[PDB]
Every structure is written in structure tokens, then in C-alpha cells.
Design a protein around this ligand. Sequence first.
Ligand code: HEM
Ligand code: DMI
Length: 291
Amino acid sequence: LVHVASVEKGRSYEDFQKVYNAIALKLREDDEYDNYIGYGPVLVRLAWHISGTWDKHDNTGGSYGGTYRFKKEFNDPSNAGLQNGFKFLEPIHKEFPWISSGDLFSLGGVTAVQEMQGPKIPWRCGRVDTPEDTTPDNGRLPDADKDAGYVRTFFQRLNMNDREVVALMGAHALGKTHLKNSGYEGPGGAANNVFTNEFYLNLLNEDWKLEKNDANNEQWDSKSGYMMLPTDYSLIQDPKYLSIVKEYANDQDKFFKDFSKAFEKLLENGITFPKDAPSPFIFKTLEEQGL
Ligand code: HEM
Ligand SMILES: Cc1[nH+]ccn1C
């Protein structure tokens, strides 16, 4: 497979900035979802799940085809809880019917990170909706109950190296695990709808205890009321991952820079950009615009 980026006909930067502003205005507005966490965290989890199905060996999956819109992908056990993110973006797709699904789902993630005071993420347009039979089968997204070798081997399918994997995982400072969605429960820290390097500081500074939860799954729990998945806790059990965790805990700006590069890479895997294509857009936040 080759998936060539094709700009939505007649659209430029100012068009996409209007879709970004519509998602950001609605994030401000529906601030009550999930006990006042808001929809920012479920929207970056949706952009990572529609992107994380990519396989570098045959170029199948990834964000290009917008195939989460199909039942097979929508009902994947690993996507439980993302229906909420889908339902949020649905009025926005009725308002801007010209944008492709892959472009809207991925732009949802970019807008959430920047509006949660995260780094600016460069974003490219050009994903094209593909037919229901290009939908990847279930089972390509990662399990939580595993160790650092599984994590490393998994992320190699999307060709992510150690630094990219540790930077990407800093997003687990956001939102929370939910028992009915995944069999895990709890938040990762206190500031769960503001983007900071909190995931790393908690992993280095809390007194974590391994316990089983009400679903019979193990997780690491701390005195503070926080939790870590086995795959999260993995990052301080592997010596190469631990040096990077320490780096990001001591330097949030380095974390923001590397998260920005890795998250754009993740959202563009599997897509060829022609060099006539527009350069990546950097969108302004509501605040930058006085809105
Ligand atoms: C080995 C990698 C990963 C595994 C096993 C994993 C697993 C999980 C699980 C079990 C949940 C909880 C779902 C729920 O109950 O609602 C979760 C939540 C979340 N994940 Fe991941 N994750 C991984 C990587 C990532 C990455 C790379 C990102 C983003 C760059 C990400 C972003 C999120 C976010 C923001 C949430 C919170 C969503 C909410 O509050 O509803 N995850 N993850
Ligand atoms: C710490 C954590 N792991 C997954 C989600 N969260 C919040």
C-alpha cells in the first residue's frame, strides 16, 4: 500500500483553523464530562488509537483512512470508551462536512494537547477516507498487563525507538483509567487535564504498591490515590527507559519538544506527502486569538 496525502479541495490554513477553533470552543463548553476532567484526555486517546493500528511491514492501518468510522474498528474491545470522543466530534463534522475523518480525528488530538497548555504540535492535512474493507482487524493495539520488553517490541511495529516511546507515554498523566472500559481504575496524578511532566515525577517519587483491583487485574497504587499500569511502571524497571524518565522529570521543556516530534510522527505514519503539499500547519490557540 501507498497512501498519498491529498488536500481537501480548495482548502487552506484558515479553513483548518476554523475546525480547530470549533473543537476548542466545544472543549471549553462541555467542561463537566468525566467528573470535570473534560474531553481533552479522551480526544488525545482517540487520535493515538486510530493511529496505533499502523503496521510498518505492509503499510496497513494508521490514521489515513479514517476507518474507526466503521463498525469493526469502532467495536474493538481496546477502543471501549472512545465512543464518547466520537460523539463529541460528530456535531463538528456536520458543521465542516468537507474535512476527512482521519483529518478530524487526528486534529481532535492536536487541539486537545494545545488547549490543555501542552506544546504546539505541527499538523498536516491530506488523509483520505478509505472503504470499509481497508478497516484493520482487531488486536493491533497494546495490552496493559505486560513488561518493558513487550512495550519495546510493540512500538517497533510503528517504528518508534526508546525516546519516542517514553515521550509518548507522558500523555498518561492525563485523564484516568476506568474500570468498565479497561478493567483498571484511577488517575495518574493530580493535574489530569493540564499537560505537564507529572507522569514522570510521580513514577519517580511515589511509593507504589502492587495490588489487584476489582476487575482482578494488577496495578500499581500509591498512598496519594494515583495508579500506574504494569506497562507504565515498566518504564522504571528497564535501565534504558529509566534514564529517559529521569530526563523528562528534570526537564519539562525537553519533554514537550520530544512529545511534539513523536506525536506528529505517530499521526503521520503510513502517509506519503508529495512536495507540492502544504508545509505542516501550526494552529493558534483560542487564547492566542482572543477567543
Ligand atoms: C503500551 C502503551 C499503552 C497502553 C497499554 C495504554 C493503555 C491505556 C489504558 C488501559 C487506558 C485506560 C482506558 C480507560 O479505561 O478508559 C489508557 C488511557 C489513556 N491513554 Fe493509553 N496506553 C498506551 C499508550 C498511550 C499513548 C502512546 C497515548 C498517547 C500519546 C495514550 C493516551 C491515553 C490517554 C490520554 C488516556 C486517558 C483517556 C481518558 O481519560 O479517558 N496512551 N491507556
Ligand atoms: C496512569 C495512567 N495510565 C493509563 C492512564 N493513566 C491515567
